[PDB]
C-alpha cells in the first residue's frame, strides 16, 4: 500500500560546501535529501567563501557536480559590492538571495538603497528570494513594488508575517512565500525541552499563536522548504550557538503525519513541495523520477536522523506516520529503506538542462 509521489523539491537548503568547518557537504546533505524524499535542492550562498561572485559560483558548481547525489541549483548571494556585476552568470543560478536581517559580514546589506540596487540590476525575469523577518517583510515588499517586480519570502514564521503577505496578495502584489517545518511543528512550548542552544534558529521559534496562524493561513503559503541548516551539537551547545536546524530527513515524515491527520490534503502538500517550487523558480521536470512512501507505520523521531552530518534533530521524540521507502531519480534507484544507492556526483545542475533555463524575452 505505497503512495507514489513525484520528485519533491526543497528550495531552501544549506549544504556547507564550499567550506572547511562543517561536517555536512554536498554528498552528505543530498543523501539526507534523498532519504527525505527530496530529488532536487536549491542551495543557499552563505558558504565559506560565500557565493557572491562568478569565481565562487564556478567553484561551488564543480563541487556540487562532483558531490551531489540528487539534482540541484545554486543561489547567488547579494552583497554590498556585487550589484550590477552578476548579469553574465545570473541565469545559471537558482536565483538571488538577499540576507536582510542577521548574517555574516560578506552578505550584510547596510542600507535599503543596496536592496533597491539589487532589485534594479538583477535580471527582471530571474527569481529573487529574501530572508526578511517581521517589518523587513514589509520593507522588501515596498522595494519590490518600487522596482515593479516579484519577491519570494523565505521561511515565514510569524502570524505578523503571514498576515502581511496575505494582505499583499489580496492587493494583487507579486509575492510568494515558503514555510519551514519547524515553524509548523515546533513552538515556544518546545524551548523547555530543546534548551537555549539547540533551540536557536532564525527566524526563531514562534508562539502557539504564530503556529496556529500559519496553519489557519495555509492558503497563503506557496511552498514548504526545510531551511536545512546543519550545525553539530558541539556548536549548538557552545558559548555562541549558531542558528539553524537540520531538516531534510524530517520534513516529509512530519508533513505526511499532518496529511494523515487531515490538517492538509495530499494535494496541498504536493502543491507546496512540487508544483509551486517548479513554477516560482522555473525548475525543470525530472524524467523518470518518483518517491514511494508508506503511510501505515508509526515511528518516533530518534535523537539523530541517519544521514545528515548535523547528527541531531529538534524533532526528537515526536511521533510521525509516514516513511520514505524508495526514491527513483532519472531512472536509477537512489534510495531504499535507509540506504542511498547513487554515488556522489550522480546529481546534476538543473540550470544547465535545456528545460531548466528561465524563459526571457530577447
Ligand X SMILES: O=C1C[C@@H](C(=O)O)NC(=O)N1
Among candidate residues 10, 210, 222, 227, the one labeled active-site is 227
Q: Where is 300: in which H helix or E strand? A: strand 290-300
> What would the grid cell of residue 27 be?
554528498
Residues 100-139 that bind ligand X (CB under 6 A): 131
Q: Does 231 bind Zn ion (CB under 5 A)?
A: yes
> What would the grid cell of residue 158 be?
510569524
Q: Which residue has the cell 531512472?
A: 331
Where does this chain touch ligand X (CB under 6 A) — which range of 113-121, 143-151, 207-215, 239-247? Answer: 239-247
**Pairing between β-strand 332-336 and β-strand 339-340 as defined by DSSP bridges:** antiparallel
14, 152, 159, 326: which one contacts ligand X (CB under 6 A)?
A: 14
> What would the grid cell of residue 209 be?
499563536
Q: In the complex, what is the shortest distance from the CB of residue 12 to Zn ion, in angstroms, rounded to a whole number?
A: 3
Where does this chain touch Zn ion (CB under 5 A) — which range of 58-66, 208-216, 226-234, 308-316? Answer: 226-234
Q: Which residue has the cell 512530519?
A: 254
Q: Report how far residue 160's alpha carbon sits from residue 325's, in angstroms, rounded to the nearest whole number.
A: 38
Site string for ligand X, 30-69 (x = CB under 6 A): ----------------x-----------------------
Known catalytic membership, residue 190: no
Residues 6+ away with beta carbon under 8 Å from 240 = none
For residue 340, what are the CA distances in angstroms to 33, 36, 69, 73, 307? 10, 11, 9, 21, 9
Nearest to 290 by CA among 332, 345, 342, 254: 332
The answer to whether 202 is annotated as binding is yes
Nearer to its own copies, 52 or 264 (CB): 264
Task: Please give the angle made by the CA atoms of 140, 146 and 151, to the nearest 5 degrees.
Answer: 40
Q: Does 201 bind ligand X (CB under 6 A)?
A: yes
Q: Report how far residue 205's alpha carbon sits from residue 7's, in angstroms, rounded to the nearest whole number.
A: 29
Q: Does 255 bind ligand X (CB under 6 A)?
A: no
Q: Does 218 bind its own copies (CB under 8 A)?
A: yes
Q: Which residues bind Zn ion (CB under 5 A)?
A: 12, 131, 154, 227, 231, 235, 242, 282, 294, 296-297, 357
Annotated binding residues for (S)-dihydroorotate: 16, 46, 202, 231, 243
Question: Where do contacts with ligand X occur on this chain (CB under 6 A)?
Answer: 14, 46, 131, 201-202, 229, 242-244
| Contact set with its own copies (CB under 8 A) | 1-6, 125, 169-170, 172-174, 217-220, 259, 265-267, 270-271, 275-276, 278-279, 285, 287, 290, 295, 354-355, 357, 359-362
**Any idea which residues carry the catalytic annotation?**
227
Amino acid at each position: 500500500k505505497l503512495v507514489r509521489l513525484p520528485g519533491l523539491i526543497d528550495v531552501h537548503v544549506h549544504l556547507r560546501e564550499p567550506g572547511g568547518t562543517h561536517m555536512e557537504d554536498f554528498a552528505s546533505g543530498t543523501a539526507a535529501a534523498l532519504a527525505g524524499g527530496i530529488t532536487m535542492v536549491c542551495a543557499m550562498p552563505n558558504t565559506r567563501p560565500p557565493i557572491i561572485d562568478a569565481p565562487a559560483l564556478a567553484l561551488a558548481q564543480k563541487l556540487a557536480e562532483a558531490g551531489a547525489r540528487c539534482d540541484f541549483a545554486l543561489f547567488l548571494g547579494a552583497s554590498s559590492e556585487n550589484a550590477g556585476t552578476l548579469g553574465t552568470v545570473a541565469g545559471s543560478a537558482a536565483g538571488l538571495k538577499l540576507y536582510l536581517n542577521e548574517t555574516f559580514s560578506e552578505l550584510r546589506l547596510d542600507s535599503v538603497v543596496q536592496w533597491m540596487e539589487h532589485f534594479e540590476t538583477w535580471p527582471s525575469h530571474l527569481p529573487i528570494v529574501a530572508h526578511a523577518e517581521q517589518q523587513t517583510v514589509a520593507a522588501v515588499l515596498m522595494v519590490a513594488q518600487l522596482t515593479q517586480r516579484s519577491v519570494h519570502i523565505c521561511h515565514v514564521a510569524r502570524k505578523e508575517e503571514i498576515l502581511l503577505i496575505k494582505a499583499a496578495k489580496a492587493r494583487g502584489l507579486p509575492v510568494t512565500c515558503e514555510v519551514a517545518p519547524h515553524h509548523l511543528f515546533l513552538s515556544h512550548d518546545d524551548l523547555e525541552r530543546l534548551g537555549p542552544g539547540k533551540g536557536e534558529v532564525r527566524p526563531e521559534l514562534g508562539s502557539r499563536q504564530d503556529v496556529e496562524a500559519l496553519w489557519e493561513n495555509m492558503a497563503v503559503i506557496d511552498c514548504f522548504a526545510s531551511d536545512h541548516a546543519p550545525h553539530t551539537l558541539e556548536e549548538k551547545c557552545g558559548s555562541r550557538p549558531p542558528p539553524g536546524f537540520p531538516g531534510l530527513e524530517t520534513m516529509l515524515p512530519l508533513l505526511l503525519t499532518a496529511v494523515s491527520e487531515g490538517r492538509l490534503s495530499l494535494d496541498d502538500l504536493l502543491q507546496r513541495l512540487h508544483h509551486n517550487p517548479r513554477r516560482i523558480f522555473h525548475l525543470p521536470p525530472q524524467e523518470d523520477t518518483y518517491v514511494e512512501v508508506d503511510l501505515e507505520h508509526e515511528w518516533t523521531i530518534p535523537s539523530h536522523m541517519p544521514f545528515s552530518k548535523a547528527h541531531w534533530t529538534p524533532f526528537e521524540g515526536q511521533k510521525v506516520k509516514g516513511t520514505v521507502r524508495r526514491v527513483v531519480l532519472r531512472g536509477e534507484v537512489a534510495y531504499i529503506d535507509g540506504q542511498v544507492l547513487v554515488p556522489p556526483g550522480y546529481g546534476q545542475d538543473v540550470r544547465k538542462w535545456p528545460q531548466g533555463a528561465v524563459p526571457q524575452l530577447p
